[PDB]
Amino acid sequence: KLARSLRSGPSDHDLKPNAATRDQLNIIVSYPPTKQLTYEEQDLVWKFRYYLTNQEKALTKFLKCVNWDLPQEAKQALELLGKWKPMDVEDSLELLSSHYTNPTVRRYAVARLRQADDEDLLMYLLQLVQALKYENFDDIKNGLIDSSQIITSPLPEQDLCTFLISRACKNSTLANYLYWYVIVECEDQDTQQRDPKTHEMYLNVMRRFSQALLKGDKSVRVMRSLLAAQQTFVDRLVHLMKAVQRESGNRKKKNERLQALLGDNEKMNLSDVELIPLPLEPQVKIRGIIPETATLAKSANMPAQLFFKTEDGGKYPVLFKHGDDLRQDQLILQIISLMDKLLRKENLDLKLTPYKVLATSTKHGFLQWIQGSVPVAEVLDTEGSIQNFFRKYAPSENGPNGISAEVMDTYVKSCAGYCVITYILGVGDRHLDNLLLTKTGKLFHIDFGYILGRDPKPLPPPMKLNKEMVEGMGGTQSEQYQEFRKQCYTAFLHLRRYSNLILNLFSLMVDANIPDIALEPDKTVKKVQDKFRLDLSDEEAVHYMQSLIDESVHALF
Numbered sequence: 390k391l392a393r394s395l396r397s398g399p400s401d402h403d404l405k406p407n408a409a410t411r412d413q414l415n416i417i418v419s420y421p422p423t424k425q426l427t428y429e430e431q432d433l434v435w436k437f438r439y440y441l442t443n444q445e446k447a448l449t450k451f452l453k454c455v456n457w458d459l460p461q462e463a464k465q466a467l468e469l470l471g472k473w474k475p476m477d478v479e480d481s482l483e484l485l486s487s488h489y490t491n492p493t494v495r496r497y498a499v500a501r502l503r504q505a506d507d508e509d510l511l512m513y514l515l516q517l518v519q520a521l522k523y524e525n526f527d528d529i530k531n532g533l534i535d536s537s538q539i540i541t542s543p544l545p546e547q548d549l550c551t552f553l554i555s556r557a558c559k560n561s562t563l564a565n566y567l568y569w570y571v572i573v574e575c576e577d578q579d580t581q582q583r584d585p586k587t588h589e590m591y592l593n594v595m596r597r598f599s600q601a602l603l604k605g606d607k608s609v610r611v612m613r614s615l616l617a618a619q620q621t622f623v624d625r626l627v628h629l630m631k632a633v634q635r636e637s638g639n640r641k642k643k644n645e646r647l648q649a650l651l652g653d654n655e656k657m658n659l660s661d662v663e664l665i666p667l668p669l670e671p672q673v674k675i676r677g678i679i680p681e682t683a684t685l686a687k688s689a690n691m692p693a694q695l696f697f698k699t700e701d702g703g704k705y706p707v708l709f710k711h712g713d714d715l716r717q718d719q720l721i722l723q724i725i726s727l728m729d730k731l732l733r734k735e736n737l738d739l740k741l742t743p744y745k746v747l748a749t750s751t752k753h754g755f756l757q758w759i760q761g762s763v764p765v766a767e768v769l770d771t772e773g774s775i776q777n778f779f780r781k782y783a784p785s786e787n788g789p790n791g792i793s794a795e796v797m798d799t800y801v802k803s804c805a806g807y808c809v810i811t812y813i814l815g816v817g818d819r820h821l822d823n824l825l826l827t828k829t830g831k832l833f834h835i836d837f838g839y840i841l842g843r844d845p846k847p848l849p850p851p852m853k854l855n856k857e858m859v860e861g862m863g864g865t866q867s868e869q870y871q872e873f874r875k876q877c878y879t880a881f882l883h884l885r886r887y888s889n890l891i892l893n894l895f896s897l898m899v900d901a902n903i904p905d906i907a908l909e910p911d912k913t914v915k916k917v918q919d920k921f922r923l924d925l926s927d928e929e930a931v932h933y934m935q936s937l938i939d940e941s942v943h944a945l946f
């Protein structure tokens with residue numbers, strides 16, 4: 390009941406803990422970021438605050454122990470904040486969560502992020518746009534309406550908002566994602582209905598972003614008109630989808646309405662435009678859609694498969710979905726993209742396919758089409774087995790089961806990567822139509838409708854493996870199966886080392902209207918944390934991951 394600062398003031402700047410207390414502190418400081426500290430642990434961290442200033446990891450624990458309402462305590466806390474060994478860029482993300490409200494703490498977080506490369510920011514931007522919900526809305530407003538018409542209707546100590554707009558003005562890729570991430574937050578009907586002040590803050594972000602662009606030099610002013618061109622392109626694509634959906638008849642009559650409307654550029658302006666960034670991948674500039682190859686994909690939703698002509702004379706296939714919230718897929722593909730990058734940083738390239746996903750609204754968006762990919766179901770239906778498929782398309786005399794050594798190496802690696810990633814992310818509703826293969830050996834998952842332990846069945850296997858994948862490698866007695874097990878436990882150990890970053894990213898998503906998070910927001914981070922088995926040592930994690938694989942594979946046969 391007596392304030393921590395009253396039970397220990399600045400007089401004991403010289404406290405050093407004994408051997409036992411150091412071991413207790415090292416355990417508290419190593420906790421996952423959203424594990425609740427007991428009052429006793431918070432007292433212990435407060436007590437040895439001056440000692441803990443030498444541990445950058447300890448600062449996030451320390452700031453959660455402060456009574457920010459007690460002026461003298463906040464004063465002492467902010468003095469220590471200044472003295473603290475500066476935390477890592479990755480680790481600052483935690484201070485932009487809902488659990489920190491102190492403006493000096495939130496400004497210190499942004500000052501740490503400022504040290505990051507644009508490559509890193511892009512990897513965290515989906516979550517930094519969520520983090521705006523925890524900023525000071527009044528300060529956002531003081532920086533200075535249909536959100537989709539802001540960018541198209543030009544008039545004739547940083548906080549998070551100021552920082553994101555400043556970095557976006559210098560980097561066209563960052564600008565592109567910032568634009569589309571904020572548009573989707575503005576179009577969110579639940580935010581509009583349940584949280585009008587939050588909707589208003591996101592409108593204010595977009596109006597500030599527009600004004601910063603209109604104030605910039607020639608290059609920066611052109612960025613605005615390129616965002617405007619993408620916005621009006623997507624608006625036309627949506628108009629076109631509504632027309633094709635409003636057509637009575639069958640896939641063939643619908644496909645002719647699609648090709649006809651794409652074919653009329655004076656009407657729709659979709660087949661022949663000045664180079665615009667592809668919203669899905671803005672590094673790729675597009676000349677327009679090829680009308681005569683456009684068709685509806687064979688599914689219930691009937692997304693348009695569209696081929697974009699690129700500035701370098703390539704074709705970039707996408708799906709455009711209308712009447713579908715892509716945000717859950719967008720988050721999972723962004724996290725797989727991050728996991729893939731962390732594995733490559735540690736020199737493990739597991740030949741993953743983090744294909745691009747962008748919501749252009751809560752109701753429509755793009756997915757990258759991986760050209761030459763086929764569902765495993767189709768590989769089975771046509772060639773009987775994965776090994777038959779690989780023998781037909783990548784044969785090798787002196788190679789495993791007569792298959793190219795490079796293709797089998799790619800297959801083993803990608804099977805391992807996806808078995809560990811789909812296990813960590815608790816991906817459900819796995820079957821041979823949402824498992825895809827390429828002729829280069831790449832296996833990958835699509836359609837992330839069930840995540841974080843959800844499944845159509847109540848007790849799904851924790852490891853998402855099937856008989857056909859293992860027979861693909863040449864069964865349980867092959868060198869390839871051994872190499873698969875080794876790559877699984879290696880990948881698991883590497884991702885555990887980034888558990889602080891991955892759990893902080895999910896922490897920043899608990900207020901996003903992503904269905905499988907919205908179900909149980911307060912339980913979301915813990916469901917990811919448990920999969921890392923952070924109660925186990927590295928050696929025990931290896932044995933645990935081998936049990937999971939052995940038990941899953943034993944049951945399959």
Ligand SMILES: C[C@H](CN1CCOCC1)Oc1ccc2c(c1)Cc1cccc(-c3cc(=O)cc(N4CCOCC4)o3)c1S2
Binds near residue numbers: 744837
């Ligand atoms: C059997 C065909 C043969 N091809 C067709 C195209 O011309 C060349 C011959 O091949 C496929 C390949 C993949 C898929 C389908 C069919 C069905 C399908 C139908 C509707 C939607 C999806 C779907 C949903 C999704 O969420 C993410 C993704 N992909 C992302 C990764 O790249 C592949 C597509 O696809 C998919 S998945």
